[PDB]
Amino acid sequence: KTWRRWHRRVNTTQKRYAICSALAASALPALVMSKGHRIEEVPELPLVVEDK
Amino acid sequence: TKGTSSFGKRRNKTHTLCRRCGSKAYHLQKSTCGKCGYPAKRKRKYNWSAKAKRRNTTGTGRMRHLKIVYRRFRHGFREGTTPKPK
Amino acid sequence: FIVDVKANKHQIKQAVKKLYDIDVAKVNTLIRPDGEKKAYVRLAPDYDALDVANKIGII
Amino acid sequence: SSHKTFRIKRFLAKKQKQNRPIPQWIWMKTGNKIRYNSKRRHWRRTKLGL
Amino acid sequence: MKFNPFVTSDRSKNRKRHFNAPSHIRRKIMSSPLSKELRQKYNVRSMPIRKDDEVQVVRGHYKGQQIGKVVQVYRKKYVIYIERVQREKANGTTVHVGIHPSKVVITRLKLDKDRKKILERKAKSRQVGKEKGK
Amino acid sequence: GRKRPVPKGATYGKPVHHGVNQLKFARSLQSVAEERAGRHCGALRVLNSYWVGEDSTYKFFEVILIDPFHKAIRRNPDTQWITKPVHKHREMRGLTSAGRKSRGLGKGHKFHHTIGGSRRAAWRRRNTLQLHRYR
Amino acid sequence: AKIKARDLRGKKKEELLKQLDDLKVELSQLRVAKVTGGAASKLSKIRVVRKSIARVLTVINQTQKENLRKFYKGKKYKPLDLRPKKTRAMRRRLNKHEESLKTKKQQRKERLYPLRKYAVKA
Amino acid sequence: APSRNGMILKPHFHKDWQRRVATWFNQPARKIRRRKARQARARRIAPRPAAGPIRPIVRCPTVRYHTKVRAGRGFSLEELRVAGIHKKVARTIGISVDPRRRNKSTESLQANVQRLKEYRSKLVLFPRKPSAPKKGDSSAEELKLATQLTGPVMPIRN
RNA sequence: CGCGACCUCAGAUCAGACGUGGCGACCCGCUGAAUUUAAGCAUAUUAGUCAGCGGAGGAAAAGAAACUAACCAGGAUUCCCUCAGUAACGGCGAGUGAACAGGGAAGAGCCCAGCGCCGAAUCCCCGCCCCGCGGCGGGGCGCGGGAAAUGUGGCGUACGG
RNA sequence: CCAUCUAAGGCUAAAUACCGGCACGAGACCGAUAGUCAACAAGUACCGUAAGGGAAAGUUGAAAAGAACUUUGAAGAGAG
RNA sequence: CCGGGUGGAGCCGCCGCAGGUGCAGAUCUUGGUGGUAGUAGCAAAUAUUCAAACGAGAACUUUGAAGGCCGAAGUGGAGAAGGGUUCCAUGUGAACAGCAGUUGAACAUGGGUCAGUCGGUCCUGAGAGAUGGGCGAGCGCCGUUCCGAAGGGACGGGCG
RNA sequence: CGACUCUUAGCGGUGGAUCACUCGGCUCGUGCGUCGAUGAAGAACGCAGCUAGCUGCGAGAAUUAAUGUGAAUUGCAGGUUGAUCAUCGACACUUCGAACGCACUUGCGGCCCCGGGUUCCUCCCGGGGCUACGCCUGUCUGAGCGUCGCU
Ligand SMILES: [Mg+2]
Ligand SMILES: [Mg+2]
Ligand SMILES: [Mg+2]
Ligand SMILES: [Mg+2]
Ligand SMILES: [Mg+2]
Ligand SMILES: [Mg+2]
Ligand SMILES: [Mg+2]
Ligand SMILES: [Mg+2]
Ligand SMILES: [Mg+2]
Ligand SMILES: [Mg+2]
Ligand SMILES: [Mg+2]
Ligand SMILES: [Mg+2]
Ligand SMILES: [Mg+2]
Ligand SMILES: [Mg+2]
Ligand SMILES: [Mg+2]
Ligand SMILES: [Mg+2]
Ligand SMILES: [Mg+2]
Ligand SMILES: [Mg+2]
Ligand SMILES: [Mg+2]
Ligand SMILES: [Mg+2]
Ligand SMILES: [Mg+2]
Ligand SMILES: [Mg+2]
Ligand SMILES: [Mg+2]
Ligand SMILES: [Mg+2]
Ligand SMILES: [Mg+2]
Ligand SMILES: [Mg+2]
Ligand SMILES: [Mg+2]
Ligand SMILES: [Mg+2]
Ligand SMILES: [Mg+2]
Ligand SMILES: [Mg+2]
Ligand SMILES: [Mg+2]
Ligand SMILES: [Mg+2]
Ligand SMILES: [Mg+2]
Ligand SMILES: [Mg+2]
Ligand SMILES: [Mg+2]
Ligand SMILES: [Mg+2]
Ligand SMILES: [Mg+2]
Ligand SMILES: [Mg+2]
Ligand SMILES: [Mg+2]
Ligand SMILES: [Mg+2]
Ligand SMILES: [Mg+2]
Ligand SMILES: [Mg+2]
Ligand SMILES: [Zn+2]
């Protein structure tokens, strides 16, 4: 049927929690290399380029 | 006697081709079509047979006026004008 | 001739008289089992139907 | 029968003309998948309704 | 990436639209690139092909530097026939083999007045783009 | 009333539906008069109707019909709601006065069963299941 | 020579019929050739003469109906084939004067109280 | 059959509910269409505020809510009469009018009267003929500093 | 007797228009079951559902209170969330089952009859001229014809006039 | 006592609905015994007096280049 | 999992997610194939034989001869209904005609049905069925002279 | 040994599974929201050089005109001042069907006009325009021991 529950609501505190945890993990070099991004020559992992 | 021998007497005809729907369902003694109900002004249709409804409906035939209606609608039934000549 | 199905014997007579410049004696019509109507047009005795058919193009 | 309605005769005329085989030049068309006429009616086998 | 919500990217829709295209859309699909010299002459990269363009086959078995005129633009099987691009049957009669115009380089056009009008229109729109970019 | 037109008074079911004789029609005889007048003069729109007399066997109603293609009605700005195609056969949809009195329409606590536009609309809106995306 | 519609419009009625029945008699001769086993050069011309007949008859009917509706342009009652063929519902609709017709009371109301243009400072 | 300790349930699924099931897969489509209709309305009434006319302060009835005030349907005719506004020009300069509403107390009457006099103080009225200003119309400085207001016009607070 | 009004009722291939029939997903008006559940079954339930009939539109219906309320009161209709599986109905069994208040989406109101006053001030149609003429409309002239005083139009409608 | 409306006449957009139609777009769907009955000359062939019932059936190859010529046989069918 | 072969264009490992997720059965559904089995059978209505022809080929086609049967309530000559080109001529022998076939009602090419007097057409029969009227929520139904202003016709006279 | 039978492998048949493809569905969503007495929906019969079906079309019949386009169509023939395609606003649109002169047989009419015929005087034949029900406004002819008035 079409009226299978396709959609799942997540609590807002948990959605912000997961954004916080994923951001926090995107600053540790082991976890992003274990994700497989080739970063073995980037000069700093929270890689902030200036606003130009 | 009620089977093979009694099938031999089948030489009359209950129905004929209808002048409205074209099917061989025009009952001759009743003078009425058993598919479209010809002497009645309204077409015989029933909601208990949707397959029979979709066998002869507006999609099924030639649409020789309505496919032109559907085309003239897209320019809003513009009439009395031509394209600009050479 | 093969004629139109709606055409009468009178119409077949006047059509042949106008088209091929002749005068006919009688017209027989039948409708062939393919649906086309066929007309046997008998010409008047002063005309020669072989010469008329040669002028039409059939021989 | 030999006694016939004009409408019955014209119906028989159409169903006579539809009972011929396919011409062979159809067979060499580009997007052809048509090989023989599957709408052939034999008078002894199938009986036209009517 | 396509952003237009009226242009479909559906594979079966694109294939149906390609294989059931009418002949004046087929003419645009049956388009061949011009040569390098014809590109620098007319500022036109691609052109629909006609019954008299002198072309080169560059992909296939009949590729090479030989030049032949198109003799027939067979739009229904999406192919063209070129002069010496042929093969022999069993009985010794030569037949023309179909070549897609995307594998075809035009070295000499049939320049009609319609063709010159199309060439000027394509060159002008290309230059409008080039002078819009700066 | 409306005698139930079953052959020989036999309604083949449970005894709650065995009623034949003392049943009543949901619309009034005045609205029956309007629909007979409209279905005869289908080229005219039923406006209203009223009672003019009765005896034991008949009721008599005068129905006001209107011709929407006459130029007086077609060119009076105060009367041209009936010229519009939505007012075809008002008497058959119950949009006249004696037609709307039978539908249970009205305002307030006596007419909670026609919230929406009808018994149809109320029953549809209440006997539905709103299955949301996120529940 | 080919028969085009462009060179047919400048002609008159009797010469259009003279072209037409010439096409009809050569079509009849082409059908005679068709049943007498004639050549493909003549069996190809059956379509050519048929569409030429179609062209001449189309020119005749187009010119004739243009002349009739030039005659009927200023009349209160024109024939039903000359009336505009919209849908039946749009022919049943009100006309533009009648949809622009307003009650004198309501006209007094929009003259007295027009919808003003305003803005609200926050 | 029931098992051990549990609730007695009455699910209302004894009808043919599956014909009349209303899924909400067109919910973001309805939201996106309602949004575009809202911006089309706001673009059409270009200096007039987007939410609509000004609505009065009403006390909710029926003791659960009678401490809370909210926006009513329209200013009542005696509120417009005390504010000195004609009941037909009110809807033309953007005031909601409720003929049906009575007053029973002085203070809600006076609060909505002061709301009307606070709204006419903020009302920047464009002249009816654009190249000719008239007697009560706003001046060309507030015409050039007119903006379209968002949200309810002077929103109601507790 | 005869002529003429009026009323009522005919006839016409009289002049001009309009309806029929189709589609029918959604909508309106009627009509309307039984399978089923109650571990049987008859009220109930299924269900104002299917089938049947009529009528539409691009939406329909509804709609500006003979309303809700009992409050410090709200304010057309429609729709969503909640009210609420609640008040209530029910072999008070099986089961059925709203409404108001509240938050929103939207948001818009108005018109007659009647009562009154204005020399019927009102409407329709044919003739001529000019314009516009493919939504048959505008201006003027007709000692042109009807309708209408058994009441048309202008003002005016409960918020009062 | 009080409160609230003013029935038995009429019109009215928007929010609302939309498994028919016209034109689209999409998919954690199905992949020819699946997905619509119907990927194909499908509401077709065929059946029933009738109301009605109702299929099977995609794929050479890149390109027909679809096997000229020789030979056996009446040929189908072979061998080259 | 790898090796070999065939095939000719896509596929899989790991972390999670989702399910129309695993077959021996349901007298399961659809399709295909066995044993039975070269078996049962090609036995109702007396009957075929000789020579020749054509043909690659003859128990069966054709011709001749012979012997027979139907025996005028026919195994004859013709129509109704029904069938619809089966009728006719030529060609073919792939498929069908339960052996064969050089033959056919098969297949493919072309042909063929001519009316004032023969029938329909016209009449009314048993009946069917509108309008009027009545009934009916309604599509409509009853009704057929019945709660009808049901005649549009004609000769003569006058007038243009 | 052999024949027959059984098992396994190789090769070959029978059969069409599997896999890989996919101009098709299914579901969801957006915009528009339009049939008909000016004859719809539907049906019948015809129309191509070779054409049965499908499709397109209507005696102008696999299409006419106009516009856009700009050299094909193609299975085989044949024959740029615009081939073919698309658009489609011009024109046309057989018979039936609400179906409409009466009937449903392709039967029978009636009125008006035109052409042959005639020598309009009828006939006869051909062609064109009308002839259905209900209903609205208006017109004319009328009906009534309906109500009056006048003489
Ligand atoms: Mg009988
Ligand atoms: Mg119906
Ligand atoms: Mg038989
Ligand atoms: Mg009821
Ligand atoms: Mg409405
Ligand atoms: Mg009441
Ligand atoms: Mg247990
Ligand atoms: Mg808003
Ligand atoms: Mg008339
Ligand atoms: Mg039980
Ligand atoms: Mg039980
Ligand atoms: Mg029981
Ligand atoms: Mg119930
Ligand atoms: Mg129903
Ligand atoms: Mg209708
Ligand atoms: Mg509509
Ligand atoms: Mg309403
Ligand atoms: Mg409310
Ligand atoms: Mg709760
Ligand atoms: Mg209930
Ligand atoms: Mg509420
Ligand atoms: Mg008055
Ligand atoms: Mg007034
Ligand atoms: Mg009021
Ligand atoms: Mg009132
Ligand atoms: Mg009211
Ligand atoms: Mg398959
Ligand atoms: Mg497969
Ligand atoms: Mg399938
Ligand atoms: Mg295969
Ligand atoms: Mg491949
Ligand atoms: Mg799955
Ligand atoms: Mg198995
Ligand atoms: Mg044996
Ligand atoms: Mg055999
Ligand atoms: Mg024979
Ligand atoms: Mg004789
Ligand atoms: Mg009857
Ligand atoms: Mg396979
Ligand atoms: Mg053209
Ligand atoms: Mg062109
Ligand atoms: Mg008869
Ligand atoms: Zn029928």
Q: Report the alpha-carbon angle D17-D23-D29, nearest 5.
A: 135
Distance from CA of F135 to the nearest CA of A (A): 8
Q: How was this structure determined?
A: cryo-EM
Rounded Cα distance between H85 and H120, Å, is 10
Q: Quick check: F130 and H22 in contact, CB under 8 A?
A: yes
Look at residues E36, E104, E121 and name the one whose alpha carbon lies nearest to residue E70: E104
Nearest CA distance, F83 vs chain G (angstrom): 8
Nucleotide nearest F99, from its CA to each C1': I29
CA–CA dist F51, F43 (Å, integer): 23
Closest chain G residue to C18, measured at CA: G25
- Find the H71 Cα to ligand 21 centroid distance in Å: 14
Scanning residues 18 through 57 of protein chain F, those with a beta carbon under 7 Å from any atom of strand K turn out to be 25, 27, 32, 35-36, 39
Under DSSP, is residue F91 helix (H, G, I), strand (E, B) or coil? helix
Strand K at less than 7 A from CB of F7 = no
How far is it, in rounded angstroms, from Cα H102 to Cα H88? 18
Angle CA(H88)–CA(H93)–CA(H99) in degrees, nearest 5?
40
Taking the CA of residue A2 as centre, how many other CA atoms within 13 Å lie in the half-sphere pointing to its CB? 11
What is the C-alpha to C-alpha distance for residues E109 and E115, in angstroms, rounded to an integer?
9
The annotation status of B18 as a binding-site residue, yes or no, is yes
Strands of C2-3's sheet in order across = C2-3, C37-43, C24-31
Q: Do chains A and H touch (3 or more CB pairs under 8 A)?
A: yes
Q: Which tokens is E65 given?
A: 């530097």
- Helix count (H) and strand count (E) of chain B? 2, 3
Q: Cβ G113–H88 below 8 Å, yes or no?
A: yes
Chain B residues near residue G90 by CB distance under 8 angstroms? 77
User: Which residue has its C-alpha nearest to nucleotide L36's C1'?
Assistant: G88
Cross-strand pairs, H59: H69
Tell me whether residue B33 is annotated as binding. Answer: yes
Q: Helix, strand or coil for residue H38? A: helix
Instruction: Tell me the sheet residues that pair with G118.
Output: H125
Could you give the C-alpha distances from H61 to F3, H58, H64, H69, in angstroms and in order?
50, 9, 8, 10
- F133 with A7: Cβ contact below 8 A: yes
Residue C57 region, left (φ>0) first, then alpha (ψ -120 to 50), else beta? left
Å between H124 CA and nearest CA of chain G: 5
Say yes or no: F124 contacts chain H, CB-CB below 8 A: yes
Tokens 């028969």 -> residue: G3
Q: E50: helix, coil or strand?
A: coil
Give the A:H interface size as CB pairs under 8 Å: 5
Integer Cα distance of G5 and H50 in angstroms: 60
Across the interface, do C58 and G36 touch by the CB < 8 Å criterion?
A: yes
Q: Is H22 on the interface with A (CB under 8 A)?
A: no
Long-range contacts of residues E120-125, Cβ cutoff 8 Å, at least 24 apart? E122/E43, E122/E44, E122/E47, E123/E42, E123/E43, E123/E44
Query: Does residue D39 approach strand K to less than 7 Å at its CB?
Result: no
Taking the stretch 8-47 of protein chain G, residues with Cβ within 7 Å of any atom in nucleic acid chain I are none
